[PDB]
């Protein structure tokens, strides 16, 4: 009764480690099924808060979407004014992900 008892201890610990996954403070994770995503509340994709969550190992996949404001800078480019005066303008935009689910779906594959 030594091999049987020792065997179960080793398999359970490694299985649990794969299942546990944490969500950082400035990050949000969306658990995903085989091809679909997990829903709740009348087909409302669920986003994870910054806490511990459990996923069936090797069946569920998590996509981590940052929630901090992202900065996008634009290089020099030519624009035509009302008097045909060509201008060279450098500008940047600041945006934040509002709907983590929608962004991941619209921008398929969570690509910046």
């Amino acid at each position: 009764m030594r091999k049987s008892v020792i065997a179960i201890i080793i398999i359970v610990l490694v299985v649990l480690y794969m299942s546990v996954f944490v969500v950082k403070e400035g990050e949000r994770g969306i658990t995903l099924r085989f091809g679909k995503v997990l829903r709740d509340d009348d087909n409302k994709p669920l986003v994870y808060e910054p806490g511990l969550h459990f996923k069936i190992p090797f069946i569920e996949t998590v996509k981590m979407l940052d929630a901090r404001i992202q900065t996008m800078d634009n290089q020099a480019d030519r624009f035509v004014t009302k008097e045909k005066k060509d201008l060279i303008v450098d500008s940047y935009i600041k945006w934040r992900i509002s709907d983590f689910s929608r962004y991941y779906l619209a921008t398929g594959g969570g690509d910046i």
């Binding site: 944490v22 969500v23 950082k24 403070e25 400035g26 808060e49 910054p50 806490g51 511990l52 940052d66 901090r68 404001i69 992202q70 900065t71 800078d73 500008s91 940047y92 600041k94």
Partner: protein
Amino acid sequence: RVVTIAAAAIVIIWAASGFYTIKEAERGVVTRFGKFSHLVEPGLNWKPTFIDEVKPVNVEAVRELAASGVMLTSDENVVRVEMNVQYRVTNPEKYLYSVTSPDDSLRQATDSALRGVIGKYTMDRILTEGRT
């Protein structure tokens, strides 16, 4: 008796690494695995190793940010203007989780601000009078 010896060995390392000292000009930010936990004040605090982590943020040192560029004035003249901006930081809950790269992002805002302001005044004013 051998099992008792093993337990003692693991706990000291947890406490040893757990103990940490934070400088006076820094303010540790203890954070749970995913969630933030609390802001620790200067001195020697303890954090359970492998459970929570501390992030020291320089809340006292005064940094500087010089913003320059060849801006356009209000009289269709060009002026090479340079400015120096001395600043500090505040509670890291905002500074760390409000905007990505707050220091650099602010610099771009400063360039937009500096360009706009210079645009309003004329070259001659900006050189002598506008300075103040």
